[PDB]
C-alpha cells in the first residue's frame, strides 16, 4: 500500500482525499496537530501521535502545537501551570519516538500581528458558528463566557501561523477545521482520527479516574484498569477493549489461555479476533488479559525512556 | 458653586456622586473619555469635550482615547484609514481649547500584557452581558459576529490601562461602564453626558446628511442645516434647536426680531427662553435664526484655529 492508503488507515475521514493526493506530490510538506496540555497522556493521545508518525514516515515535517493559550481560554487554569504541563507533554511525545518540532501557542499567539489577525477573523465569524464549533470541545456552560468564542478563532489563527498543509485532530475538531477551511487563504487538508472510547464505556477516553490507560502507567495499573473496563461478552460496538485491540496491537498475536476452554489461541488479525469475540468463543476475561499484556509490551519503551530521563 | 456642582452641571448621571466627592479630594486625579474616530466632529462630540474641559478646570489631568482598535472591531473600516481619521480628530479636539493627552487604542492595545488581560476578562464576561452592553453602540446585526463581544472587553481593558479615576461618555456607554465597574480592581467613577438629539429630530446627532452641525461647518452650512431642523412651534421635548440653546449658548442673549411680533427679545437664561417658546411667544423661525448666529460665533474660534493650521 502507498503513502496515501497508509495515512488513510484507521482514520475517520480526510477532507479531502483528492487534496491529500495533491499534497503528497509536493517535495516539502508539513502536518500539525494541537493538544491542550493534559496531566495524563493516554491512548487517546497516542492514537493521534501514531498518525503523526505515519505522516512523518510519508515525508511530512511534523509540528506539534502545545496549545497553552487555547487551554487557558478553555478554562484549564493559569498559564504558568498550563505551560508546566505542556513541558511534560513535550517529553512524553518525544518518548513516543516522534520526530517533531514543538510550538507553544503563546510563542507567537500574543504577538501584535497574530492578535490583529484574531480580531480580523472575529470580524468574519458569527457568534453562532463559533459557538457550534465548540459543542464537542467545551462543557456547555450555564451562561457561556466570551472566551468560548475566542477559542475557535485562536485555533484557526494558529493553523494559519503554523502553516501546515495538513491539520490532524480528533473528530471533535471537525467544526473548527471546517471553519479554518472557510476563513484562511490556504485550505488545510484535515485528517480526523476516531474517538477512542474510555475504559468506563461511557464517552471518550479522558483523565477521569480509571477511564484511561496512560502511556506511562505501571504494569499493575494497566492490568487493574483493563480488568475492570467495560467489556460485555460478544459485544464489539463501544467496547474499549476491542478498540484497543484494533488500534494498538500487533498481529499475528497469541492469546494465552489455560486448558478449560483453551488453550493458546492464535489470532492472525484484528478481524479474526473480532469474529471469535462476537461468537463468544473468546471470553472477555481472556481478551482483557491478552490486551493488558500486549499493552504493557507496547508501552514499555515509552515508560522506560521517560523513567531513564533525569 | 463648587467643583462638584460645576462638574455635575448638564450631566445625565454620575456613578456615583459620593465617589466623585472622594476623587475630588485627591491631589492628582485623571479623567478619560474614548471616541471612535469620526469623519465629522459635531456638537454631540463638543458637548462631551466641554465636560472634559470642566473636569480639567477642576484639576483633572485629561486623557482622550482615540479608539482606533475599538472602531476596527465595530466594523468602521481598515486600521490605516481609521487611524487617519483619528489624527484629524486629535487636531479638532486640540482646536477646541482642550489641554489633554491623546492615546490611540493600538498604542498599547496590541501589547502582550494587554492582550493577555483581554483574554482574562473574556473568561469573566458572559456572552449575554457582552451582547447587552453593545445594544446602544452597534447596529444589531443579522447574525452578530464575535468581534461585537470583543469590543466591550477591549473598552473595559482600555479603561484599566489608561488608569483614570473618572470615565466620561454618553449615556449609551453606561452598560460598558457598569461592566468596567464589575471587572476591574479599581472602580472608575462614571460621568455620563446626555444624548444630543440630531437635527432631523430622529435619534442622536450623527454624521448622516443634514443631521449634525460639525464644529468646523461654514456659516452658510450652519444656517442652512439649522433652518431645516426639526423644530415644531411650542415644542421643547426632543427639539434639537432647544437642546442646542440649552447646552451651548451663553446668556443673557438678545434674539434679533423685526417689528411685526418684534422686536429684539432679551432672554436672561435658557429657562426664560423655554417659557417664551412653550407659550408660542417666540416662533421657531426667530429661535432658529438666533441659534444659528450664536452657534456661528461659538464655533468660530474652532473653525479658524483649524483653518490657520498649514
Ligand atoms: C486553540 O488552540 C488549539 C487547541 C487545540 C486543542 C483542540 N481544540 C482540542 O480541544 O482537542 C489544538 C490546536 C490548537 O491550535
Ligand atoms: C473599545 O474602545 C473604546 C471605544 C469607545 C467608544 C464608545 N464605546 C462609543 O461607541 O461611543 C470609547 C473608549 C474606548 O476605549
UniProtKB/Swiss-Prot annotation, chains A, B:
A motif ('KMSKS' region) lies at residues 204-208. CDD domains: TyrRS_core. L-tyrosine binds at residues 32, 36, 173. It catalyses: tRNA(Tyr) + L-tyrosine + ATP = L-tyrosyl-tRNA(Tyr) + AMP + diphosphate + H(+). Its EC number is 6.1.1.1. Pfam families: tRNA-synt_1b. It is found in: Cytoplasm. The keyword RNA-binding does not apply. GO terms for molecular function: ATP binding; tyrosine-tRNA ligase activity. Residues 228-231, 283-288 are annotated as: Interaction with t-RNA. The record marks 143 as: Interaction with t-RNA. It is an enzyme of class 6 (ligase). Residues 151-158 are annotated as: Tyrosine. Keywords: Aminoacyl-tRNA synthetase, ATP-binding, Cytoplasm, Ligase, Nucleotide-binding, Protein biosynthesis. GO terms for biological process: tyrosyl-tRNA aminoacylation. A motif ('HIGH' region) lies at residues 37-45. GO terms for cellular component: cytoplasm. SUPFAM superfamilies: Nucleotidylyl transferase. ATP binds at residue 207. Catalyzes the attachment of tyrosine to tRNA(Tyr) in a two-step reaction: tyrosine is first activated by ATP to form Tyr-AMP and then transferred to the acceptor end of tRNA(Tyr). Belongs to the class-I aminoacyl-tRNA synthetase family. TyrS type 3 subfamily. Homodimer. This is Tyrosine--tRNA ligase.
Amino acid at each position: 500500500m502507498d503513502e496515501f492508503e497508509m495515512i488513510k488507515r484507521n482514520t475517520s475521514e480526510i477532507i479531502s482525499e483528492e487534496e491529500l493526493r495533491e499534497v503528497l506530490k509536493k517535495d516539502e510538506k508539513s502536518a500539525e496537530i494541537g493538544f491542550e496540555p493534559s496531566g495524563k497522556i493516554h491512548l487517546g493521545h497516542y492514537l493521534q501521535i501514531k498518525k503523526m508518525i505515519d505522516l512523518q514516515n510519508a515525508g511530512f515535517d511534523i509540528i506539534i502545537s502545545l496549545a497553552d493559550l487555547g487551554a487557558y481560554l478553555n478554562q484549564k487554569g493559569e498559564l504558568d501551570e498550563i505551560r508546566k504541563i505542556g513541558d511534560y507533554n513535550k517529553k512524553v511525545f518525544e518518548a513516543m519516538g516522534l520526530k517533531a518540532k514543538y510550538v507553544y501557542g503563546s510563542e507567537f499567539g500574543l504577538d501584535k500581528d497574530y492578535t490583529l489577525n484574531v480580531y480580523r477573523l472575529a470580524l468574519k465569524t458569527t457568534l453562532k458558528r463559533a459557538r457550534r464549533s465548540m459543542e464537542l470541545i467545551a462543557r456547555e456552560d450555564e451562561n457561556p463566557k466570551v472566551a468560548e468564542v475566542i477559542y475557535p478563532i485562536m485555533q484557526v489563527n494558529n493553523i494559519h501561523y503554523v502553516g501546515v498543509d495538513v491539520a490532524v485532530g480528533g473528530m471533535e475538531q471537525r467544526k473548527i477545521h471546517m471553519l479554518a477551511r472557510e476563513l484562511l487563504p490556504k485550505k488545510v487538508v484535515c485528517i480526523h482520527n476516531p474517538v477512542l472510547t474510555g475504559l468506563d464505556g461511557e464517552g471518550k477516553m479522558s483523565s477521569s479516574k480509571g477511564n484511561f490507560i496512560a502511556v506511562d502507567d505501571s504494569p499493575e495499573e494497566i492490568r487493574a484498569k483493563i480488568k475492570k473496563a467495560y467489556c460485555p461478552a460478544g459485544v464489539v460496538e463501544g467496547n474499549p477493549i476491542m478498540e484497543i485491540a484494533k488500534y494498538f496491537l500487533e498481529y499475528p498475536l497469541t492469546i494465552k489461555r489455560p486448558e478449560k476452554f483453551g488453550g493458546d489461541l492464535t489470532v492472525n488479525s484484528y478481524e479474526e479476533l473480532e469474529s471469535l469475540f462476537k461468537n463468544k468463543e473468546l471470553h472477555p476475561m481472556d481478551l482483557k488479559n491478552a490486551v493488558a499484556e500486549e499493552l504493557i509490551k507496547i508501552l514499555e519503551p515509552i515508560r522506560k525512556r521517560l523513567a531513564a530521563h533525569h
